[PDB]
């Protein structure tokens, strides 16, 4: 049985992307400090321990699942699109996610808020005419007070409906005070939608929408994600495990149940 690792994860021959201090999801939404991972690509994406978000407090229900779908696709290729928001103020941002000189937010997201006196009943539609699936990512904002709710979106209680021809998610914000994070008792909630060719993404809302900036090109799940604090070395090795590289010469390995590449069976 193979029962020992070098201890390092060899940089060759699979394209290994070290996220350093960004997890995948943070690099995906576009946490200011993961701006470097933009449009990046990999076979194996290793998430370290350091990893800490550092932008608007958010929670992703169905995280581990959304995390895996992206990890598999192995590309982080974002494609901006021409969304048309008429009647609201775009580019919203905050101090909990500073960028440049001040207020910032997730690069891949667009915070809409009222335009002076009002927040119209938004209702855009964007058709997927292409020959590949689209993975839009959006969010809903939950102010922690009815004051905040009204300052930003006017309406006393918002709603976000993101429908395609086969689905229909209608989430409604939930006002209340959550634990303080980077000075905030507020939060955003990340949701997603994959649009199959010949389908139409339809965003209708009248409050709290945290609009998509475009879509993520999705290829076929050949790549994978893995958490490990293993160093990365310059060497050639085919079987990668959270513990490091282990040779695939023996038929059974007992090092770890998680591995990448032509590996010995786990025992």
């Amino acid at each position, epitope marked *: 049985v193979q029962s020992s690792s070098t201890g390092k994860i060899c940089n060759n021959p699979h394209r290994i992307l070290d996220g350093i201090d960004c997890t995948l999801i943070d690099a995906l939404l576009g946490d200011p400090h993961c701006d470097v991972f933009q449009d990046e690509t990999w076979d194996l994406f290793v998430e370290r321990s350091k990893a800490f978000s550092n932008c608007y407090p958010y929670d992703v229900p169905d995280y581990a699942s959304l995390r895996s779908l992206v990890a598999s696709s192995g590309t982080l290729e974002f494609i901006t699109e021409g969304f048309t928001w008429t009647g609201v*103020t775009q580019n919203g941002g905050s101090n*909990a996610c500073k960028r440049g000189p001040g207020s910032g937010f997730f690069s891949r997201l667009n915070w809409l808020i009222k335009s002076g006196s009002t927040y119209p009943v938004l209702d855009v539609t964007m058709p997927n005419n292409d020959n590949f699936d689209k993975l839009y990512i959006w969010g809903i904002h939950h102010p922690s007070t009815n004051q905040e709710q009204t300052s930003l979106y006017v309406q006393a209680s918002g709603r976000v409906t993101v429908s395609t021809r086969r689905s229909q998610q209608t989430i409604i914000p939930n006002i209340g005070s959550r634990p303080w994070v980077r000075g905030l008792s507020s939060r955003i909630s990340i949701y997603w939608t994959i649009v199959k060719p010949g389908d139409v993404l339809v965003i209708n809302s009248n409050g709290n929408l945290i609009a998509p900036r475009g879509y993520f090109k999705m290829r076929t799940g050949k790549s994978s994600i893995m958490r490990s604090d293993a160093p990365i070395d310059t060497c050639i090795s085919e079987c990668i495990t959270p513990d490091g590289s282990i040779p695939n010469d023996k038929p059974f390995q007992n090092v770890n149940k998680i591995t990448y590449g032509a590996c010995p069976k786990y025992v």
Partner: antibody
Amino acid sequence: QVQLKESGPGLVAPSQSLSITCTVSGFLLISNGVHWVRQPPGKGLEWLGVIWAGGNTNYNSALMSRVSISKDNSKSQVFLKMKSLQTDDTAMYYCARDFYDYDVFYYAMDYWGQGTSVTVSS
Amino acid sequence: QAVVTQESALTTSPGETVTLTCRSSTGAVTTSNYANWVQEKPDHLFTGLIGGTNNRAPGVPARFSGSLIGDKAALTITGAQTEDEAIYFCALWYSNHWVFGGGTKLTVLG
């Protein structure tokens, strides 16, 4: 950096139509609003109206019947159009950026333009 | 919409602590009004000073402070210097309509 410049006529005769232009740089019109403030010689300032990032506008009740603010988001230009001009309109015309803080929730006029003088004389 | 009123001119000397004020015909000046304090320097080159009543704008020296003093808004130069001579305009927000004050001429006897 933020930056706003006004370019207009300088001299227009009573009963014609005033057309100033505030060309903004370093921020998008879909990200902020732009205000119009006029200062007649030896007087206080006067707020003319505002065009929000959403395009909707809000004018000063008084002059509203003659004012009209617009904008071409793709050119980074806001447009103050005044008709039925009368001598009193001689003043400095300024455009200042509308700012809103998302964390404390307050409005403010942060970036003022350099201004452009307009004399209404026949 | 309403009428913002403030001192015509005020004359201080270097060192002293002056306080321009900003009144509302329509009542007390609440936080709802977002008292804005613009500073007009020579040859009308306006500059933001304080916004939302007390939020000091970046360049603005620490010595300028925004506050509510009773039912009117205020600005307090603490230790005025000759370079504080200027017309200080107060602006009050009333429902998607701004309303400036007459402006105060501040003299700093030098």
